[PDB]
Design a protein around this nucleic acid. Structure first.
Ligand code: FES
Ligand SMILES: [Mg+2]
Ligand SMILES: [Mg+2]
Ligand SMILES: [Mg+2]
Ligand SMILES: [Mg+2]
Ligand SMILES: [Mg+2]
Ligand SMILES: [Mg+2]
Ligand SMILES: [Mg+2]
Ligand SMILES: [Mg+2]
Lengths: 137, 99, 99, 122, 48, 128, 72, 96, 85, 107
RNA sequence: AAACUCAGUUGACACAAAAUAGACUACGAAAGUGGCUUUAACAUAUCUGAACACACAAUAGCUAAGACCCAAACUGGGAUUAGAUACCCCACUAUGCUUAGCCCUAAACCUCAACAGUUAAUCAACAAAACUGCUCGCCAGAACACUACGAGCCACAGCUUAAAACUCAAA
């Protein structure tokens, strides 16, 4: 076989495994990188919450939350919690272009957890709601 | 646009100059050049094609007439009296090897 | 019986050739500047190819080489240009030395 | 005119599926359709979860009913399909084969636009 | 020709009589409209 | 409106068209066609009933008859889509065009104009 | 020129060839030009079918010894 | 008079006009396999003609067919169907 | 309502999350999602949207024409073959 | 294939309304725009975390401090080599364009 | 800062708005029209032709009844400020939506009228090269003036038409 960047298809017979598990069963680390806060939540393959960590819960307040350093800190905390909950390999789904988008992943990894996949689930309306008006400064 | 009358036709988007008109015009031009040379006029060969600058210079020198294949400083003809001197004699004929 | 321009053009090798694209011609290196080989193939312009890294020294002035032509003249019209911009050189691929 | 009804039916067994197809073609013939052909594209997983008649569906059977009907019958057929519960999703379209494949000689290229600006020197 | 061709086909149209049988035949069959294309403009039908 | 059983203009002359299956007849009838076919049938019927030369369509008479069929179609349409401003404009413009055509016809060939008016139920009213 | 039709057909059917053009020689004759000459004389014989003329010209050149390779 | 003069004819040397890959073929909303060749594998985004290489008419046909299939339930929207990821690539796009 | 972990999903090779993220961001940029989100943050009134679209179209036309000219003339960056004369 | 400009600008003989309204004329200029203008923070963060957990005693953070210093030296070397290498250039490109300039008028 | 204890995952779920396609330039008379399906449907074998009528006319706005995710004049609060009746942040309303009427205004601008034709001897400047024929509408210093009066209008702080007096040598 050869390496493919696409994920394995559920219901298809694939050879890839992680910790003796199939891709579908790997726990999911939902990152949410808002403009001024980066939240992280590691749920099991059955949406069972395992760990939580946010810039605010890490002690950062006000603008300091929206910093890659704060994202790294929150990711490290979440990774430690998940590691003590028994999580090795994770699938990462991040929804938001906030400053913590990548530093959160870096913190999560530095906390020990390995990442098998990165998923972007940023909400992109197909012209649904009307966002707030522009800013003139 | 002005070269159309002398263009015989476009072969695969490549103009073919009407060599009949070329022959007649070259006859007239050579006749004029020879007449000026006989009348002892000054014949100046102008051409900025660097690929033939050397050839034009050598040809002019061997034929005994003048050549300007270099950068044409502004005023070589209009301001000649100042640039050279009030008594300078301007060319009686200018021959462009590359217009 | 004096052949006229029409007959000369009709029987000329260039006219006998069709579109120059993908046509093999025999050029004659008439100038070399370092690793650049200026080759004349009978057309209006010359093609400046590169000395092949293999058998490079074998290429010298007067060397007869084989070219695969891609355009007799390299020209194109760019945005806003009232006339075509030309690089005044043909495009060809240097295949090797003819013997 | 010639219509094609693409029909995503609830995933079920052959007896119920045949009964549903029979009922649907019966409704067509009642509204005044001359059913021309029935084709089974086969059961497959719905590309996305579809919730029809208080039931979330992930697999369904796809069927194509090519028929001829009066124009006024299309709306009634759509309403009846909406009423029917075994239909996860029905859609009536004008048959593609009624349209004619215009012959395309080639992609004639658009040359660079000329004379957009006056040739005066700027 | 068009009316002639249509005449032939109408023999195969599903009526209120041959409805059960045609429905069962449809359930048995499988029609494939899927086929990809290649850069050289050559169809790639799936294998069955 | 012509009977729904009526065949289309491209099939009413096909040899043996009456010796075919009633399924084929229903398919080729107006019962399985859009409103344009019915309008074409109405146009040809009016032409046969009125114009001396039905095969001539460039005539002002054929133009007026076709435009009257279109006016009928637009009026029927607006009767349901009362709030279709575009088609209301089309109806008014077509009425104006038919009035202009009738003016020209009345000025050129009076007898034909009278026959057109009677056939299409149009009452020519001089503009105020 | 009327020979342009034959030239285009020959290039489409056999490609450029392997005998490179020598534009320096005014009297040079390309394989395509020889084909055109043979086609012209065959036409002057009074054979009007274009495709029959083409095949006959190809075979005549093959008999001459010209290796006309078809492109596909 | 003179037979060596040029004659007035079309350009016999013209190359055939390139035909889009789908030229002469029927794009159908039911051929999800074909329709999925012109959608981003990751996001489901329909490729522009600068990438597909299709004529304007066929690009419009593909767009309408893709939208029709997506709304009628034949084709996924947010992503290309995985079953078609290994079909012959016909899009001049390089994500790596 | 679609299946999860098939859209905008990339598999890291050997664990180089930085490389995987670079590839994912390339995907998003080439698909235009990044620009779409940045623009959708605040509502771009339709007149402004049209003006920006027209401006970008003109800028692309100019850039592509300039690139064509640069490529066409790049073959003339050689050394001067008639140095002096 | 550059986007078409046929029928895109508001011009006489163009029935449709303008598609593009270029602020500046669409004529290639004879010049290209001038080239437009932290490093090694992972090692710094590692060293600073070691300092924080060890009371900044450099005695028990020697490997991290040395890595930080060497990384900074390599950053300086990268800056220098990049600068010298950067020194196609806009200047060269403008010279070539000048050699073959645009002609939006008639000669 | 204020504001909320609502936040995250998964599932169910609109009378809101319609990513990518679109690097396309099409439809319509203009305003406008870019999710999908269907029905109807896009006037004139000659061109011009409304202050002289008919039918349309984005956004805003009034009337009466519904929907209300989000956005949001006004309003309130938090900031900033010398002040802040603003710009920045939060909440919320009319409103944007559907139905039935009204209203009939836009930088309604491609500021380039319709039709037919030419590229020849150019052309104040800039802009989107210069003109020919024909027709309709419009213009005749600036400001007073999208004004007052009169008139018409479902309009009642409105719209259309629209002057004059004083003033200036400019605009
Ligand atoms: S290339 Fe022929 S239809 Fe597009
Ligand atoms: Mg008129
Ligand atoms: Mg008017
Ligand atoms: Mg209005
Ligand atoms: Mg409200
Ligand atoms: Mg407007
Ligand atoms: Mg006003
Ligand atoms: Mg007023
Ligand atoms: Mg009043």
């Amino acid at each position: 076989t050869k390496f493919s960047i696409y994920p394995p298809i559920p219901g298809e017979e694939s050879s890839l495994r992680w910790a003796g598990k199939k891709f579908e069963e790997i726990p999911i680390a939902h990152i949410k990188a808002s403009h001024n806060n980066t939240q992280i939540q590691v749920v099991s393959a059955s949406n069972e919450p395992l760990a939580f960590a946010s810039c605010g819960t890490e002690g950062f307040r006000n603008a300091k939350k929206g910093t890659g350093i704060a994202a790294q800190t929150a990711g490290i905390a979440a990774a430690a919690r998940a590691k003590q909950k028994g999580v090795i390999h994770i699938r990462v789904v991040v929804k938001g272009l906030g400053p913590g988008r990548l530093s959160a992943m870096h913190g999560l990894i530095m906390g020990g957890l390995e990442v098998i996949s990165i998923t972007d689930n940023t909400p992109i309306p197909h012209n649904g709601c009307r966002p707030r008006k522009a800013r003139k400064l | 646009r002005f070269m159309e009358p002398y263009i015989f036709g476009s072969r695969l988007d490549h103009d073919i100059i009407d060599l009949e008109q070329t022959a007649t015009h070259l006859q007239l031009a050579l006749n004029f050049t020879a007449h000026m040379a006989y009348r002892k006029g000054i014949i100046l060969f102008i051409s900025r094609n660097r690929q033939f600058s050397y050839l034009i210079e050598n040809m002019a020198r061997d034929c005994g007439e003048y050549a300007h294949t270099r950068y044409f400083r502004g005023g070589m003809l209009t301001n000649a009296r100042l640039l050279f001197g009030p008594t300078v004699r301007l060319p009686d004929l200018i021959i462009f090897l590359h217009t | 019986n004096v052949e006229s321009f029409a007959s000369m053009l009709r029987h000329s090798p260039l006219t006998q050739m069709g579109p120059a694209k993908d046509k093999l011609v025999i050029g004659r290196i008439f100038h070399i500047v370092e690793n650049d080989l200026y080759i004349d193939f009978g057309g209006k312009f010359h093609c400046v190819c590169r000395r092949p890294e293999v058998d490079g020294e074998k290429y010298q002035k007067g060397t007869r080489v084989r070219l695969r032509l891609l355009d007799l003249e390299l020209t194109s019209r760019f945005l806003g240009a009232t006339t075509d911009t030309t690089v005044l050189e043909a495009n060809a691929v240097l295949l090797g030395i003819q013997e | 005119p010639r219509y094609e009804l693409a029909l995503i039916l609830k995933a079920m067994q052959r007896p119920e599926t045949a009964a549903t197809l029979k009922r649907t073609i019966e409704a067509l013939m009642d509204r005044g359709a001359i059913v021309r052909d029935l084709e089974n594209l086969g059961e497959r997983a719905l590309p996305y979860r579809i919730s029809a008649h208080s039931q979330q569906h992930n697999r369904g059977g796809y069927f194509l009913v090519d028929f001829y009907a009066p124009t006024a019958a299309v709306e009634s057929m759509v309403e009846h399909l909406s009423r029917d519960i075994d239909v996860i999703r029905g859609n009536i379209v004008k048959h593609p084969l009624t349209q004619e494949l215009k012959e395309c000689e080639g992609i004639v290229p658009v040359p660079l636009a000329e004379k957009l600006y006056s040739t005066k020197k700027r | 020709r068009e009316v002639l061709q249509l005449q032939e086909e109408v023999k195969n149209f599903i009526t209120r009589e041959n409805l059960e049988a045609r429905v069962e035949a449809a359930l048995d069959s499988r029609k494939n409209y899927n086929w990809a294309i290649t850069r050289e403009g050559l169809v790639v039908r799936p294998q069955r | 409106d012509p009977p729904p059983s009526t065949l289309l203009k491209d099939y009413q002359n096909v040899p043996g068209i009456e010796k075919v299956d009633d399924v084929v007849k229903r398919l080729l009838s107006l019962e399985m066609a859009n409103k344009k076919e019915m309008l074409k049938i109405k146009q040809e019927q009016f032409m046969k009933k009125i114009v001396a030369n039905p095969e001539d369509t460039r005539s002002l008479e054929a133009r007026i008859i076709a435009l009257s069929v279109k006016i009928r179609s637009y009026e029927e349409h607006l009767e349901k889509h009362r709030k279709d401003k575009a088609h209301k404009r089309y109806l008014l413009m077509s009425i104006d065009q038919r009035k202009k055509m009738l003016k020209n016809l009345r000025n050129t060939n009076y007898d034909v104009f009278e026959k057109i008016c009677w056939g299409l139920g149009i009452e020519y009213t001089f503009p105020p | 020129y009327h020979e342009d039709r034959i030239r285009a057909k020959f290039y489409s059917v056999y490609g450029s060839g392997q005998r490179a053009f020598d534009l320096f020689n005014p009297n040079f004759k390309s394989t395509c030009q020889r084909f055109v000459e043979k086609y012209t004389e065959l036409q002057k014989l009074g054979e009007t079918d274009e495709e029959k003329l083409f095949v006959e010209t190809g075979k005549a050149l093959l008999a001459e010894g010209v290796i006309l390779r078809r492109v596909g | 008079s003179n037979e060596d003069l040029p004659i007035s004819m079309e350009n016999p040397y013209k190359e055939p006009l390139k035909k889009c890959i789908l030229c002469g073929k029927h794009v159908d909303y039911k051929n999800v396999q074909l329709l999925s060749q012109f959608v981003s594998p990751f996001t489901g985004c329909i490729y522009g003609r600068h990438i597909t290489g299709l004529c304007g008419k066929k690009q419009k046909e593909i767009t309408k067919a893709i939208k029709r299939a997506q709304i009628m339930g034949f084709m996924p929207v947010t992503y290309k169907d995985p079953a078609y990821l290994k079909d012959p690539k016909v899009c001049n796009i390089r994500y790596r | 309502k679609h299946l999860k972990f098939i859209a905008r999903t990339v598999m890291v090779q050997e664990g180089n999350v930085e490389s995987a993220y670079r590839t994912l961001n390339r995907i998003l940029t080439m698909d235009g999602l990044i620009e779409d989100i940045k623009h959708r943050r605040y509502y771009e009134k339709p007149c402004r949207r049209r003006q920006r679209e027209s401006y970008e179209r003109c800028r692309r036309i100019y850039n592509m024409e300039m690139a064509r000219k640069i490529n066409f003339l790049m073959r003339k960056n050689r050394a001067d073959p008639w140095q002096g004369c | 294939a550059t986007p078409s400009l046929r029928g895109r600008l508001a011009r006489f003989g163009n029935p449709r309304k303008p598609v593009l309204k270029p602020n500046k004329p669409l004529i290639l200029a004879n010049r290209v725009g001038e080239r437009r203008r932290a490093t090694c923070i992972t090692e710094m963060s590692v060293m600073m975390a070691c300092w924080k957990q060890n009371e900044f005693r450099d005695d028990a953070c020697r490997k991290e401090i040395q890595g930080f210093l060497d990384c900074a030296a390599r950053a300086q070397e990268a800056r220098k080599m990049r600068s010298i290498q950067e020194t196609l250039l806009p200047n060269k490109l403008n010279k070539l364009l000048q050699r073959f300039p645009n002609k939006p008028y008639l000669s």
